[PDB]
Design a protein around this ligand. Structure first.
Ligand SMILES: O=c1ccn([C@@H]2O[C@H](COP(=O)(O)OP(=O)(O)O)[C@@H](O)[C@H]2O)c(=O)[nH]1
Ligand SMILES: OC[C@H]1O[C@@H](O)[C@H](O)[C@@H](O)[C@@H]1O
Length: 426
């Protein structure tokens, strides 16, 4: 039996993503171990995973910016990783973008090392060519502001739309990102949670045979109260608003969205978290819950978004453009309004709006605050306008081209099968 070791970077988000890949490789006959470096209870995750997928093993390495402590942990983890790999060398190693230091270990032991890139191919291209651009300027991306950055196969990118940890060149975390992007070029191959029919130009631009190959296997996709509420509403009539894992708005900004949602007159399901420093009556405009009881439902902190997006009553998604939320909207054919917030979401927004044309922006996301007028305008536009009809049509195409890529013979199933064979023969 051929054995694969998958190495996510610390963080429940990275672990959940990498586990989805572990279940696939296992499905197709590989013997999978996931390496854990600890920074929402890893222990509970390992217990549930072992009960549901016993063939996937876990190995927890002993302990030696918000990404900055992760980067230190990973570096000081190379000795423990080395030893576990010396015990039983595997046929192949699968790394996270943040796990570049492990390429030291994988080269010494002559182990084929693949990256699992959990964002799209457009982002990979930007991340591939960032060190090049770094040598060609002295300015910070923050100093450059709206000056466009030109990377292969993707729209121009305003330099302040680069990821927040990369905005100030005079910081150690900037240097680590430069470091991880360079080491991208030492890979055997790139496994990407995208499908080729979604980002053709991007997939072409990186398949230049002066770079490792790449395999497009996605979309890889990962309570009772609001699902009930949705049942009681007509088909395609609800606007779903949900802003990722940590997303946070100020009470002032929450008041603008409330006013805009109310004046749009549309039905809504809105996930609200505590502002950065949830008490809905203290935070929301007075009488807003009373007045909209009936048309809208506000849920605190967390919603079952995968189910919500699959529900037939949902007609639209105001999203922070995280890549898991974007793939889940596409697979269910839900048209989007793009309101990016942190990590690489601003970049994702550009690709979504101008390359894929699957969303329209929420103007003001780059300003101090999105206005009530704008929230109302785009909510109306999404659920009523002929432009909204045109957009659903492109989202409908995307749903079918995604579902097709995953069915037998489709382009994702064949890309999966192709890399499995290549690890078996490693
Ligand atoms: O209330 C919420 C918010 C998020 N999610 C899930 O959390 C993930 C968010 O991943 P994404 O990459 O979109 O955003 P990030 O984690 O970077 O905030 C997705 O699977 C969502 O469906 C969820 O289930 N409920
Ligand atoms: O592993 C996937 C993780 O990678 C990051 O690049 C994303 O911003 C997160 O949304 C995600 O949880």
């Amino acid at each position: 039996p051929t054995t694969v070791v998958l190495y996510p970077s610390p963080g429940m988000g990275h672990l959940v993503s990498m586990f989805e890949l572990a279940k696939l490789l296992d499905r197709h006959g590989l013997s999978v171990t996931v390496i854990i470096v600890e920074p929402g209870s890893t222990a509970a995750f390992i217990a549930r995973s072992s009960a549901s997928n016993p063939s996937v093993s876990f190995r927890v390495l002993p302990r030696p910016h918000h990404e900055a402590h992760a980067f230190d942990l990973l570096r000081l983890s190379n000795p423990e990783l080395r030893r576990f790999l010396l015990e039983s060398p595997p046929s192949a190693l699968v790394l996270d973008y943040f796990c570049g230091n492990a390429l030291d270990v994988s080269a010494e032991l002559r182990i084929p090392a693949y990256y699992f890139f959990t964002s799209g191919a457009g982002v990979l291209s930007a991340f591939l060519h960032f060190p090049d651009l770094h040598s060609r300027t002295a300015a910070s991306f923050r100093e450059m502001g709206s000056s466009p950055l030109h990377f292969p196969g993707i729209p121009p990118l305003p330099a302040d739309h680069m990821p927040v940890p990369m905005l100030d060149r005079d910081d150690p975390v900037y240097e680590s990102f430069l470091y991880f992007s360079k080491r991208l070029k030492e890979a055997e191959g790139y496994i990407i949670n995208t499908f080729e029919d979604l980002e053709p130009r991007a997939v072409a631009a990186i398949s230049d045979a002066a770079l490792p190959p790449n395999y497009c296997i996605g979309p890889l996709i990962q309570g009772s109260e609001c699902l009930a509420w949705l049942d009681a509403q007509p088909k395609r009539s609800v606007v779903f608003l949900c802003f990722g894992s940590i997303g946070l708005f100020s009470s002032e900004q929450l008041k603008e969205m409330a006013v805009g949602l109310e004046r749009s007159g549309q039905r809504f399901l809105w996930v609200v978290r505590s502002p950065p420093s949830p008490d809905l009556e203290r935070i929301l405009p007075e009488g807003f819950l009373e007045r909209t009881e009936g048309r809208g439902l506000v849920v605190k902190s967390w919603a079952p978004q995968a189910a919500v997006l699959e529900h037939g009553s949902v007609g639209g998604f105001v999203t922070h453009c995280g890549w898991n939320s974007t793939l889940e909207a596409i697979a269910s054919g839900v048209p989007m309004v793009a309101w990016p917030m942190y990590a690489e979401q601003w970049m994702n927004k550009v690709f979504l709006v101008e390359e894929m044309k699957l969303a329209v922006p929420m103007e003001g996301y780059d300003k101090d605050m999105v206005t009530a007028e704008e929230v109302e305008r785009k909510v109306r536009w999404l659920m009523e306008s002929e432009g909204g009809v045109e957009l659903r049509a492109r989202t409908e195409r995307a749903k079918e081209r995604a579902a097709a890529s995953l069915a037998e013979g489709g382009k994702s199933k064949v890309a999966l099968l192709e890399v499995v064979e290549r690890m078996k023969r490693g």
